[PDB]
């Protein structure tokens, strides 16, 4: 892959890495047997982190700048959501000690969300699991995911796709390099942002169904 | 909106 | 391959023309219409009737909705700010704004229609990425996942096939219509919201199969 | 489950 290419994946994947260590998370959460109720206020803490960094994250992507200040806004609250997900699929299914990971899995149920939302979701990691994807496939479709040009109030939709174009041909070729004996990773990973757009659809009725901070009011449309 | 633009 | 894509484009074609009173009722009663023709296309797709029978129930019952708006979509591509129902009555974007829904409307146009014209969406194509929505592993309770994942993927691979020797001065064609897919999704899911309103305020002839596939079973 | 039932045969 072509050397103008290649330096662009390395802004992406230096950008990525100002994300907390899945270790830092995963001890958040399996430290102490918690209150059902302080999950929340854990949980509420960790998504206005992850939101803090994806911003910076957006900023640096060639050319966010060049869009229009209000399809920033746009493109950001329409895949805050989708990216969040995408990132506790990544954490939940890197490799933990013996019986920490199941311990994980129960705890995140016992957090007052109901079960017509939670198992979705872990069906959804188990799923990304599988895909055994590197850091670097990660990192290009989270990416992808924020320059959706199918986003709503996206007054220049064209300026978008020229954007997320260049990524698509990059995530190509490292799923021919990293997965050649999975000849359509490719394709098997873009199935995973249609699967991603359920939770954006359900998450604000997730949510009400059972505060919070501000930076999350603002970006989830939720109070 | 607020916080999130800037 | 194992997934012939003109076999497939086969059951595109097997199961459409046809030439020749509010907005809403009239999309319900179309909708209606396809249910039926829909099981017809399935079985017509290579693989799918050789699946359990209770598979086929949840694949269809999971999808139906993102399989006819992607099919009465493409039909539209001749239409202009507007939609062909396949009961041959067009439905114009000025009459959906007026009858509450133009917000919903306007985004088929936008992501679906006009996107599907502007890179000449073929037949194939829009029968392969149908094939996609069909069989989708992540359906609740189905039997063997790993089953529907495999076919699903023998489609993929077909679909790319097709792509690089059909137009090959077009490289990322193929993601290209790959990602309607999460647009048609999120159509879909917006499309279940109305109708499960507009069944429950009761204001809309909805008919027996449409019904069917609206109730929890 | 009644018509879906029945067209799958
Ligand atoms: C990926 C990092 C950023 O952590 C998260 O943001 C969340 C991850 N979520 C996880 O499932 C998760 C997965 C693996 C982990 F190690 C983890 F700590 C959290 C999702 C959810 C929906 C429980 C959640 C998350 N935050 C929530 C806030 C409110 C209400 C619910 C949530
Ligand atoms: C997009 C759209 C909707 C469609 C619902 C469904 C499921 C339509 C399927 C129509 C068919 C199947 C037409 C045809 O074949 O001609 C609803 C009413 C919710 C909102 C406004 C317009």
Same mark, same amino acid.
């Given at each position: ?5 290649? =330096? ?35 949980? =509420? ?20 700048? =060049? ?51 939670? =198992? ?54 490292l799923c021919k390099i990293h997965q050649p004996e999975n000849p359509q990773h490719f394709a098997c990973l873009l199935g995973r942002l249609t699967e991603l757009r359920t939770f954006n659809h359900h998450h604000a009725e997730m949510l009400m169904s059972w505060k919070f901070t501000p930076l999350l009011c603002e970006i989830w449309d939720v109070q | 909106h607020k916080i999130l633009h800037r | 391959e194992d997934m012939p894509v003109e076999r497939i484009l086969e059951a595109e074609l097997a199961v459409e023309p046809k030439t020749e009173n509010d907005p809403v009722t009239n999309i319900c009663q179309a909708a209606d219409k396809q249910l039926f ?38 039909? &539209? ?39 599907? !014209? ?24 189905? &039997? ?28 990322? !064609? ?11 999704? &999120? ?31 | ?9």
């Open positions: 892959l072509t050397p103008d290419q290649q =330096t662009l994946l390395h802004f992406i994947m230096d950008s990525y890495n100002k994300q907390r260590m899945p270790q830092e998370i995963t001890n958040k959460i399996l430290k102490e047997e918690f209150s059902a109720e302080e999950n929340f206020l854990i949980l =509420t803490e960790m998504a206005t982190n992850h939101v803090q960094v994806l911003v910076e994250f957006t900023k640096k992507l060639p050319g966010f700048q =060049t869009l229009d200040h209000e399809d920033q806004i746009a493109l950001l609250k329409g895949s805050a959501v989708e990216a969040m997900f995408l990132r506790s699929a990544e954490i939940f299914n890197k490799k933990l000690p013996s019986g920490h990971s199941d311990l994980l899995e129960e705890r995140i149920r016992n957090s007052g969300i109901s079960d017509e939302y939670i =198992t979705p979701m872990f069906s959804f990691y188990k799923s990304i699991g599988e895909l055994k994807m590197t850091q670097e496939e990660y990192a290009l479709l989270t990416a992808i995911v924020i320059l959706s040009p199918d986003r709503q109030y996206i007054k220049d939709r064209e300026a978008v796709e020229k954007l997320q174009e260049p990524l698509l041909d990059v995530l190509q070729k | - | 023709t829909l099981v017809e296309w399935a079985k017509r797709i290579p693989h799918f009737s050789e699946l359990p029978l209770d598979d086929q129930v949840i694949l269809l019952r999971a999808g139906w909705n993102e399989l006819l708006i992607a099919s009465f979509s493409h039909r &539209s591509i001749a239409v202009k700010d507007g939609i062909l129902l396949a009961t041959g009555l067009h439905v114009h974007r000025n009459s959906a704004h007026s009858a509450g829904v133009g917000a919903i409307f306007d985004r088929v146009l936008t992501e679906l229609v006009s996107k599907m !014209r502007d890179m000449q969406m073929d037949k194939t194509e829009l029968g392969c990425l149908r094939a996609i929505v069909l069989f989708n592993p992540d359906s609740k309770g189905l &039997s063997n996942p790993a089953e529907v994942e495999a076919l699903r993927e023998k489609v993929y691979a077909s679909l790319e096939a097709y792509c690089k020797h059909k137009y090959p001065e077009q490289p990322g !064609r193929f993601a290209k219509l790959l990602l309607r897919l999460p647009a048609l999704r &999120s159509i879909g899911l917006k499309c279940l919201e109305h109708l499960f309103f507009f069944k429950l305020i009761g204001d809309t002839p909805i008919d027996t199969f449409l019904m069917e596939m609206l109730e929890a079973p | 489950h009644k018509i879906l039932h029945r067209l799958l045969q």
